């Protein structure tokens, strides 16, 4: 990944 | 296959228990961070966990609990405090980082007293916002008791909530609620001290020591169980406490439930007393099981002499599996003796082990270990006479004056100890009176010596922080199992130089008449300690006379409501009279 959001 | 640990734990525990356990896990380490900070992080963790229950491939879900917990603790703890002990831990990588956290739980933190508002204010708050009211209950507790058994804390939380749900629909709200609350408070303090002993044992004496303790207690409780069953439970029970004492709250809560579930599924192989426990809901189930009565022991158990003393093969059978052989011996001795304290059983097993190590190395081992049970008689009579003598003392004295007796005794034993600490330990030692002397003597020793183990462990934990008494350090470090006899054996410290007479210590004001009964006795007991530190040779008789004059003086000045000059004048008159003895 790395990234993040919160999705959810 | 559970590619995401957080989702696994969330599914096993349910959203409600998970949110609560997370809040606990952070507050026990981050004890000085304010309430709102913990609220915010709890919500973020929940948001994240819910994310993963849906899609396990989402960001960061395949990471470990240690890595996740570490990362989150560090960014929270360093936000305001950029350099600190947690800053040091956070320069480490896993796994050294997770272990570094262990030293950053403060045991008796500098934290304000918790003062309850009016009954009416509490219930409006409880009605006006339930979730926050209850989280504040968890937060304020976890941070003051960083070693609280987390699954048990959830249980208290259930009972705290239930108290409010009942008592604020009630016709006399305060007469309903305050008794329910004060009992939880006292139970919570007693629960927390029990775990602190578990964690201290595990840390200062090792897994093996804890496992021995567990084999003893579970064999007394479940005497019909086969030895291999006890060993399984001991192993699971030890994994549970290792996980909570090292901060892995989600894992130890899940693993405690599985343990309750196992036990209820195997009642027949374990005990006949678990039937009511096992019909209760999840949190009460685990609580009930750990409090359950001893089962009857099986009918015609042979004496241990055949297998462990008279056989010529003791040494060969010991060497094939020493921990199994001693475990069996402990199991056999414990299951036949519910009337012995656990620490005494451990004391007995350690004596047996010591004898075998010595005897199996000597020329004729059989003639050497033949007498080993004769060594147990003195070890059994010592505590039996301690309890009997002290219960007689408590019977005529009551809890308050019984505490004063133990106050003088331990002040003369370890005068180097700070007065506040001496007052607290002595007050807690004195609660064995109410707690244990009512039971028939056939159950007194386990009640008493096991409770005293908890109290002394608090003394050791307090003292280690700021050490001043070499004798205290020796008694705490030399043997977990022998702490209580080590202290009882202490003679009066005749090397101690008396404290100089300072007239302010023994001056008292009318401000003592406004205090709660508990806070007034502590001030009276502080003075008794400082008197003994001033004249350590004063006799039990002379000190009783003074404390009776003192209590008179204090109650003979509260009823006065004069210019309160009663303390200044009648008090210097009390000091002349005390000098008379
Ligand atoms: O599910 C796809 C979606 O949610 C998440 C991500 O890692 C991105 O691929 C994106 O915006």
Query: What are the helix (H) ranges across B415-469?
Result: 419-436, 441-465
Contact between B227 and B328 under an 8 Å Cβ cutoff? The reply is yes
Angstrom distance (rounded) from CA B446 to CA B383: 10
Angstrom distance (rounded) from CA B400 to CA B524: 11
Q: What are phi and psi of B262, to 5 degrees?
A: -55, -50
Angstrom distance (rounded) from CA B250 to CA B252: 6
Question: How far does the centroid of ligand 1 lie from the alpha carbon of residue B46, in Å?
Answer: 19
Domain ranges for chain B? 5-102, 119-201, 202-290, 304-381, 382-489
Q: What are phi and psi of A5, to 5 degrees?
A: 25, -115
Angstrom distance (rounded) from CA B208 to CA B326: 12
Q: Report which DSSP code applies to B295.
A: P
- For the segment(s) B5-102, the CATH number from 3.30.420.40, 1.20.1730.10, 3.40.50.450, 1.10.246.10 is 1.10.246.10
At the top level of CATH, the class of B202-290 is mainly alpha
Q: Do domains B5-102 and B304-381 have the same CATH topology?
A: yes
Size of interface A-B (CB pairs under 8 A): 13
Specify burial of residue B125 (Cβ count, 10 A radius: 0-12, 13-18, 19+): middle
Q: Cβ(A7) to ligand 1 under 6 A?
A: yes
Q: Report which DSSP code applies to B478.
A: S
- Which chain B residues have a beta carbon less than 8 Å from that of A7? 51, 55, 58-59
Nearest to B56 by CA among B8, B98, B113: B8
Count of Cβ atoms closer than 10 Å to residue A6 Cβ = 9
- Which chain B residues have a beta carbon less than 8 Å from that of A1? 59-60
Do residue A1 and residue B60 have CB atoms under 8 angstroms apart? Answer: yes
Angstrom distance (rounded) from CA B414 to CA B536: 11
Cα–Cα distance list, B518 to B163, B185, B417, B515 (Å): 24, 15, 22, 8
3-state secondary structure B294-321: CCCCCCCCCCCHHHHHHCCCHHHHHHHC
Angstrom distance (rounded) from CA B428 to CA B406: 10
Q: How many CA atoms lie within 13 A of B463 on its CB side?
A: 26
Nearest to B252 by CA among B216, B198, B200: B198
3-state secondary structure B213-244: HHHHHHHHHCCCCCHHHHHHHHHHHHHHHHHH
Instruction: Please say whether the structural domain B382-489 has been given the CATH code 1.10.246.10.
Output: yes
Residues in chain B: 581
Peptide bond into B95 cis (omega under 30): yes
Nearest to B292 by CA among B265, B314, B270: B270
Q: Cβ(A6) to ligand 1 under 6 A?
A: no
Q: Can you tell me which atom of ligand 1 is nearest the CA of A1?
A: 7
Cα–Cα distance list, B249 to B25, B239, B252, B289, B490 (Å): 6, 12, 5, 20, 40
Q: What are phi and psi of B6, to 5 degrees?
A: -60, -40
Contact between B296 and B223 under an 8 Å Cβ cutoff? The reply is yes
Question: How far does the centroid of ligand 1 lie from the alpha carbon of residue B62, in Å?
Answer: 16
Q: B304-381 has which CATH code?
A: 1.10.246.10
Closest residue of A to B63, CA-based? A1
- Nearest by CB to A4, from B47, B55, B59: name it: B59
Nearest to B472 by CA among B15, B481, B458: B458
Q: Report which DSSP code applies to B306.
A: I
What interhelical angle do B249-265 and B5-29 show, nearest 10? 120
Resolution for this experimental structure (Å): 2.8
Nearest to B353 by CA among B544, B212, B164: B212
- For the segment(s) B119-201, the CATH number from 3.30.565.10, 1.10.246.10, 1.20.810.10, 1.10.10.10 is 1.10.246.10
Q: Cβ(A3) to ligand 1 under 6 A?
A: yes
Contact between B391 and B433 under an 8 Å Cβ cutoff? The reply is yes
DSSP B1-48: --S-HHHHHHHHHHHHHHHHHHHHHHHHHSTTS-HHHHHHHHHHHHHH
């Amino acid at each position: 990944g790395y990234x993040x959001x919160x999705x959810x | 296959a559970h590619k995401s640990e957080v989702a696994h734990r969330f599914k096993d525990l349910g959203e409600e228990n998970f949110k609560a356990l997370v809040l606990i896990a952070f507050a026990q380490y981050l004890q000085q961070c304010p309430f709102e900070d913990h609220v915010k992080l709890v919500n973020e963790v929940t948001e994240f966990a819910k994310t993963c229950v849906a899609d396990e491939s989402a960001e960061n879900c395949d990471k470990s609990l240690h890595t996740l917990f570490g990362d989150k603790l560090c960014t929270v703890a360093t936000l305001r405090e950029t350099y600190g002990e947690m800053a040091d831990c956070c320069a480490k990588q896993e796994p050294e980082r997770n272990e570094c956290f262990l030293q950053h739980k403060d045991d008796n933190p500098n934290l304000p007293r918790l003062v309850r508002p009016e009954v009416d204010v509490m219930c409006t708050a409880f009605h006006d916002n339930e979730e926050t009211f209850l989280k504040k209950y968890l937060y304020e507790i976890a941070r003051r008791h960083p070693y609280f058994y987390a699954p048990e804390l959830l249980f208290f939380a259930k009972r705290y909530k239930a108290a409010f749900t009942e008592c604020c629909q009630a016709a006399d709200k305060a007469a309903c609620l305050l008794p329910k609350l004060d009992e939880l408070r006292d139970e919570g303090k007693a629960s927390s001290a029990k775990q602190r002993l578990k964690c201290a044992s595990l840390q200062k004496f090792g897994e093996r020591a804890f496992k021995a303790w567990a084999v003893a207690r579970l064999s007394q409780r479940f005497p019909k169980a086969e030895f291999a069953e006890v060993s399984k439970l001991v192993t699971d029970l030890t994994k549970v406490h290792t996980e909570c004492c090292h901060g892995d709250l989600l894992e130890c809560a899940d693993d405690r439930a599985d343990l309750a579930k196992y036990i209820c599924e195997n009642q027949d192989s374990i005990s006949s007393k678990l039937k009511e426990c096992c019909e209760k809901p999840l949190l009460e189930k685990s609580h009930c099981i750990a409090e359950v009565e001893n089962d009857e022991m099986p009918a015609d158990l042979p004496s241990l002499a055949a297998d462990f003393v008279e056989s010529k093969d003791v040494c060969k059978n010991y060497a094939e599996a020493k921990d199994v052989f001693l475990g069996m011996f402990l199991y056999e001795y414990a299951r036949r003796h519910p009337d012995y304290s656990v620490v005494l059983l451990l004391r007995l097993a350690k004596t047996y082990e010591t004898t075998l190590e010595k005897c199996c190395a000597a020329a004729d081992p059989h003639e050497c270990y033949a007498k080993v049970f004769d060594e147990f008689k003195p070890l059994v009579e010592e505590p039996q006479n301690l309890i009997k003598q002290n219960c007689e003392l408590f019977e005529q004295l009551g809890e308050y004056k019984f505490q004063n007796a133990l106050l003088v005794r331990y002040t003369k034993k370890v005068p180097q100890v700070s007065t506040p600490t001496l007052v607290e330990v002595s007050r807690n030692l004195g609660k064995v009176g109410s707690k244990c002397c009512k039971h028939p003597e056939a159950k007194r020793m386990p009640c008493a010596e096991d409770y005293l183990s908890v109290v002394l462990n608090q003394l050791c934990v307090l003292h280690e922080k700021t050490p001043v008494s070499d004798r205290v350090t020796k008694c705490c470090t030399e043997s977990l199992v022998n702490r209580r006899p080590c202290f009882s054996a202490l003679e009066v410290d005749e090397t101690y130089v008396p404290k100089e007479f300072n007239a302010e210590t023994f001056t008292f004001h009318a401000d003592i008449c406004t205090l709660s009964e508990k806070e007034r006795q502590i001030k009276k007991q502080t003075a008794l300690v400082e008197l003994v530190k001033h004249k350590p040779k004063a006799t039990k008789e002379q000190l009783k006379a003074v404390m009776d004059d003192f209590a008179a003086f204090v109650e003979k000045c509260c009823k006065a409501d004069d210019k309160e000059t009663c303390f200044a004048e009648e008090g210097k008159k009390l000091v002349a009279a005390s000098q008379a003895a």
